């Protein structure tokens, strides 16, 4: 049922995975948004999780990004996959990261925590971004130094590309930070979004709600932090309906792992 098969796998670290699937000829989506997938338990019964899309919208496959949770009824079994096999997937893309959820302006802010960074695989990844702002600002904030590496990889193959390079003309500003781990960036987003040392380290304007919009993607705790320190700058949650200076969305719902 709603069959796509599994043309890649990547394993980053042993609660990480990325992968990619075979895409349904007649899905349309917008970079941002998420899809239910899924694979049968041992009755034969579905089981259904919603994963952001990866890969950007012009993509011929579909790209995943993947937690590893032991006893989790999905990842305990999508984490051993392997190209052939096959995944459950609903072809009805939805959810409010998304560029036209937001009001035009000239820089565009991801923050993500952990998995979080999924919907702007795909988004850092797309076109748009890059035609309606000036500046895309990334920060990405994980526990430990492994965890940055799907994201790192990305952003490095854009960067280092002479074509993508070109068209992408220097706009995307990259602040990976760990909290636990030793790097030479840390602490999280909401503690250096409020203090002004992403602005310090990256060299740009401080946040600006006639300019910035942002898209926040994290556990529930990170998304409510996060709004207060959007809000102590000016910025205000809308969506598609009204379109406001910024977006949220669970990375998963729970405490998280
Ligand atoms: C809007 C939406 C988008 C999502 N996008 C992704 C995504 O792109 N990639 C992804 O791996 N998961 C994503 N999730 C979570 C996903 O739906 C499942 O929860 C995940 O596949 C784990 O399923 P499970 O059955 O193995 O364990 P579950 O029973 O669902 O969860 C077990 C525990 O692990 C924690 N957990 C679940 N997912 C995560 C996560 N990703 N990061 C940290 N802790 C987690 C939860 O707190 C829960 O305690 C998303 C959830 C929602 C609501
Ligand atoms: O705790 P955890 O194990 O649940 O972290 P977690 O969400 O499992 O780990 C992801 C990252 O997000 C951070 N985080 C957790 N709660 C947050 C909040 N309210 N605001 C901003 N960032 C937050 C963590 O920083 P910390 O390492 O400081 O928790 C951690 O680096």
Redesign the pocket.
């Given at each position: 049922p709603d069959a796509q098969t599994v043309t890649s796998v990547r394993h980053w670290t042993d609660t990480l995975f990325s992968f990619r699937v075979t895409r349904p000829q007649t899905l349309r989506f917008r970079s941002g948004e998420f899809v239910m997938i899924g694979l049968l338990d041992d009755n034969g019964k579905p089981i259904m999780r919603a994963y952001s899309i990866a890969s950007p919208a012009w993509d011929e496959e579909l790209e995943f990004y993947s937690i590893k949770v032991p006893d989790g009824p999905l990842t305990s079994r999508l984490q051993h996959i392997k190209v052939g096999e096959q995944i459950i997937l609903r072809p009805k893309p939805v959810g409010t990261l998304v560029i036209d959820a937001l009001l035009p302006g000239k820089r565009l802010w991801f923050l993500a925590?952990?998995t979080?960074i999924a919907p702007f695989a795909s988004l850092m990844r797309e076109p748009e971004a890059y035609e309606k702002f000036d500046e895309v600002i990334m920060m990405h904030?994980?526990?430990?130094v492994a965890?940055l590496e799907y994201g790192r990889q990305l952003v490095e193959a854009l960067q280092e590309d002479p074509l993508i390079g070109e068209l992408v003309e220097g706009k995307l500003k990259y602040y990976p930070?760990?909290?636990?781990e030793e790097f030479h960036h840390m602490?999280?987003?909401?503690?250096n979004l409020a203090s002004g040392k992403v602005f310090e380290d990256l060299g740009i304007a401080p946040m600006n709600p006639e300019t910035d919009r942002a898209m926040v993607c994290?556990?529930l705790?990170?998304?409510?932090?996060?709004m207060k320190v959007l809000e102590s700058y000016g910025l205000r949650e809308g969506a598609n309906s009204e379109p406001r200076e910024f977006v949220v969305e669970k990375?998963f719902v729970g405490?998280?792992?």
């Amino acid at each position: 049922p709603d069959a796509q098969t599994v043309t890649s796998v990547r394993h980053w670290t042993d609660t990480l995975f990325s992968f990619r699937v075979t895409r349904p000829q007649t899905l349309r989506f917008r970079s941002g948004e998420f899809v239910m997938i899924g694979l049968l338990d041992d009755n034969g019964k579905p089981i259904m999780r919603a994963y952001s899309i990866a890969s950007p919208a012009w993509d011929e496959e579909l790209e995943f990004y993947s937690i590893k949770v032991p006893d989790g009824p999905l990842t305990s079994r999508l984490q051993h996959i392997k190209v052939g096999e096959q995944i459950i997937l609903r072809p009805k893309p939805v959810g409010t990261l998304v560029i036209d959820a937001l009001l035009p302006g000239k820089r565009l802010w991801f923050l993500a925590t952990g998995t979080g960074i999924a919907p702007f695989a795909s988004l850092m990844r797309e076109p748009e971004a890059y035609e309606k702002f000036d500046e895309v600002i990334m920060m990405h904030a994980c526990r430990t130094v492994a965890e940055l590496e799907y994201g790192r990889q990305l952003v490095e193959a854009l960067q280092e590309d002479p074509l993508i390079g070109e068209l992408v003309e220097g706009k995307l500003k990259y602040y990976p930070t760990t909290t636990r781990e030793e790097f030479h960036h840390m602490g999280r987003i909401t503690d250096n979004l409020a203090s002004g040392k992403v602005f310090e380290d990256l060299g740009i304007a401080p946040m600006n709600p006639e300019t910035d919009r942002a898209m926040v993607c994290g556990s529930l705790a990170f998304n409510v932090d996060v709004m207060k320190v959007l809000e102590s700058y000016g910025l205000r949650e809308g969506a598609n309906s009204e379109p406001r200076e910024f977006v949220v969305e669970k990375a998963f719902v729970g405490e998280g792992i």
